[PDB]
């Protein structure tokens, strides 16, 4: 009942357009691997859009001024905040339904990650255009923790390799099963394929 | 205009054995192997002809920004063929007016220090690119020699030691000093 959305390969505002509308309908979505969202245009463009955002501070007291978040999770959390009516009570309860994380939490390491085809780079952006990752852009603004995240994501990536290898090991045993049992399940297979299964 | 097709054959010699993992083309032979990924060009790479006699590249429905990327695909490929068959030899002549430029290599050719350039007390430690070998020539008093297989790595190291010997806040037209490219050649001429 809770969506887990993989952030790699998604546009910034296109994924936020899907997420923010789904949040307001009362359905919790978890956006994960937020270093993987990429932004259209060349890299040197998107740097100055967000570096000029760093210049947006109140002259008299920057401490209460705009909070320039540096982690790619909170950058994506910032762009959903502007697309939601956070000044009202409905908007504030909506942000509690949105959980946005960098890397892969061990809460969601064994959860299947959804992919939105309406926000992917390959389907939305032309192949000849340029794109800029948010993870690389955040580090050059001041996000320190890309080396810690890369070592942990590499550890998470190889940990899923044994599980997938065990999934293939069980799948060949799944496939081996109907090749010695088909002589006694041949009264149960055709009723599936005369209704459109296993074809 | 979106042209329907733009084609060019790449004739390779028999002594070069090449392969390709999709767009990542691997060129190997006598002097070693060369790997260069050909992604982000959005063109296909078809290796046709038995015993691998030619390479063919096409582009479908493109405009003039990626018609110009068709020929740079072949041009990078021939430099990989040329760098494996005959290599790349860029002789690096040094030009000085009064103070001779003393150049000597340290490990094999990797570290090159430049001293007595315009009488400067500051030595200039310049590292070469990986896979690029540097040496001093013979039968002539001062000329540097750069060896390698990749055209981009060898020539960038030549530009590194060319831009290291630059004159500051002087008349460049009079102070014709520094180390400059002399000839662009190969290890053997076949």
């Amino acid at each position: 009942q809770v969506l887990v959305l993989d952030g790699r390969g998604h546009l910034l505002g296109r994924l936020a357009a899907i997420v923010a509308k789904q949040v307001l309908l009362g359905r919790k979505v978890v956006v994960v691997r937020c270093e993987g969202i990429n932004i259209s245009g060349n890299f040197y463009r998107n740097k100055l859009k967000y570096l000029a955002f760093l210049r947006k501070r109140m002259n008299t007291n920057p401490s209460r001024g705009p909070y320039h978040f540096r982690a790619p999770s909170r950058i994506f959390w910032r762009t959903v905040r502007g697309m939601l009516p956070h000044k009202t009570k409905r908007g504030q309860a909506a942000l509690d339904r949105l959980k946005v994380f960098d890397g892969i939490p061990p809460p969601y390491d064994k959860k299947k990650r959804m992919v939105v085809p309406a926000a992917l780079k390959v389907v939305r952006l032309k192949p000849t255009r340029k794109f800029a990752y948010l993870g690389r852009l955040a580090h050059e603004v001041g996000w320190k923790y890309q080396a810690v995240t890369a070592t942990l994501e590499e550890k998470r990536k190889e940990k899923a390799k044994i599980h997938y290898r065990k999934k293939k090991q069980l799948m060949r045993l799944r496939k081996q099963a109907e090749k010695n049992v088909e002589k006694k399940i041949d009264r149960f297979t055709e009723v599936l394929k005369t209704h459109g299964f296993l074809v | 205009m979106k042209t329907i097709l733009s084609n060019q054959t790449v004739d390779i010699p028999e002594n070069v054995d090449i392969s390709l993992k999709g767009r990542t083309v691997i060129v190997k032979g006598p002097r070693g192997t060369l790997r260069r990924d050909f992604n982000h060009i959005n063109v296909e790479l078809s290796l046709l002809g038995k015993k691998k006699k030619r390479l063919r590249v096409d582009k479908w429905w493109g405009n003039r920004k990626e018609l110009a990327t068709v020929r740079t695909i072949c041009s990078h490929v021939q430099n990989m063929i040329k760098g494996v068959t005959l290599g790349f030899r860029y002789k690096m002549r040094s030009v000085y007016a009064h103070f001779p430029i003393n150049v000597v290599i340290q490990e094999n050719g990797s570290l090159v220090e430049i001293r007595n350039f315009l009488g400067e007390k500051y030595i200039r430690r310049v590292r070469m690119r990986p896979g690029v070998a540097c040496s001093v020539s013979q039968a002539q008093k001062d000329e540097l020699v750069l060896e390698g297989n990749d055209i981009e790595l060898v020539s960038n190291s030549a530009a590194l030691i060319q831009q290291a010997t630059t004159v500051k806040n002087k008349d460049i037209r009079k102070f014709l000093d520094g180390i400059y490219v002399s000839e662009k050649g190969t290890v053997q001429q076949a």
Binding site: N59, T60, P62, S63, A71, D102, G103, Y145, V148, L152 | -
Partner: protein, 345 residues
């Protein structure tokens, strides 16, 4: 309109929170960067500002006008008693920060170290660590921590050691010891921790930490000066004598369209008692404390190879407002931050 004559800013723009420090002990905000090449050693240490004195020494720097001539030089005497290691702690790097993993305390904890965990030692029943210390002599408790030590060697990245000073060897009136974690820099995590496993409930002198002519940093708290005016908190220009509302205040604050007084505008407030990290302090002499073989060794405290005297570093009548130094000491070039008897890191 524009300012007529340009002038530099009064006061630093890097030290705006001029509040009284929430802590009294100097805190290491940034430990030195790790490298698995050198052997394991300490990185930080706790001292106490005793006093100051002169050093007449020979400066042999080339190219100077003071070449092969002597100078006098102000230094600061810091009495530095040896530590007692009473525990270790492990840290693991996270995407949200650098979170601690597990804390392992020693079995025998000194009563001076136990004074830190109590706000009122007289009315307390001294029940701290009464049941934790029962997890050592039993085989089940020892096996329960044996896997805990191995858990650190697999998951932790930065290993810091918990050490405290001794108030029994000081002329200080207080008896509550000061705790600080000290990062251990060395090779891999496994043998780095095993060095700290062997050095539990031990004595750590200063020579294990620092040596001759080391080039170190000082961390401490500024001497508090109370609520001071803006002419002393920021050293602004005094107004002339003809002023009616006073002459020790900033005259013009800001403009009419909102320059609604900024953080960068100098105001009156708290001056002193600010945490400061002042770096590049050269050690001249690591001292050796009082020790007796048959007779009292006052001889070898302030004696050099040219003085050949029996004087100690304690002056006639002792150090002012501190006491008399009995333990080994570190002498730091120049003045350091903090007043007398101040806990210095």
């Amino acid at each position: 309109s524009h300012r007529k004559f340009s002038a530099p800013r009064h006061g630093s723009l890097g030290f705006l929170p001029r509040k009284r420090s929430s802590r009294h002990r100097g805190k290491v905000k940034s430990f030195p960067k790790d490298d698995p090449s050198k052997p394991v050693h300490l990185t930080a240490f706790l001292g106490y500002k005793a006093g100051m004195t002169h050093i007449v020494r020979e400066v042999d720097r080339p190219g100077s006008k003071v070449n092969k001539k002597e100078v006098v030089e102000a230094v600061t005497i810091v009495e530095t008693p040896p530590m007692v290691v009473v525990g270790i702690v492990g840290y693991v790097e996270t995407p949200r920060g650098l979170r601690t993993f597990k804390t392992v305390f020693a079995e025998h904890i000194s009563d001076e170290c136990k004074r830190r965990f109590y706000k009122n030692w007289h009315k307390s029943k001294k029940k701290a660590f009464t049941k934790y210390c029962k997890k050592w002599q039993d085989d089940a408790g020892k096996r329960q921590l044996d896997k805990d030590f191995s858990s650190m060697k697999k998951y932790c990245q930065v290993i810091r050691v918990l050490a405290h000073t001794q108030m029994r060897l000081l002329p200080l009136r207080q008896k509550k010891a000061h705790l600080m974690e000290i990062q251990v820099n060395g090779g891999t995590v496994a043998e780095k921790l095993d060095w700290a496993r062997e050095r539990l409930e031990q004595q750590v002198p200063v020579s294990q930490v620092f040596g001759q002519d080391e080039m170190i940093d000082v961390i401490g708290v500024t001497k508090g000066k109370g609520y001071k005016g803006v002419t002393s908190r920021w050293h602004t220009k005094k107004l002339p004598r003809k002023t009616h509302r006073g002459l020790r205040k900033v005259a013009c604050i800001g403009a009419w369209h909102p320059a609604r007084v900024a953080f960068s505008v100098a105001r009156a407030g708290q001056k002193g008692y600010h945490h400061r990290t002042e770096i590049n302090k050269k050690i001249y002499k690591i001292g050796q404390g009082y020790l007796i073989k048959d007779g009292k060794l006052i001889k070898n405290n302030a004696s050099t190879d040219y003085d050949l005297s029996d004087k100690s570093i304690n002056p006639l009548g002792g150090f002012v407002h501190y006491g008399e130094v009995t333990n080994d000491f570190v002498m730091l070039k120049g003045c350091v931050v903090g007043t007398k008897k101040r806990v210095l890191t």
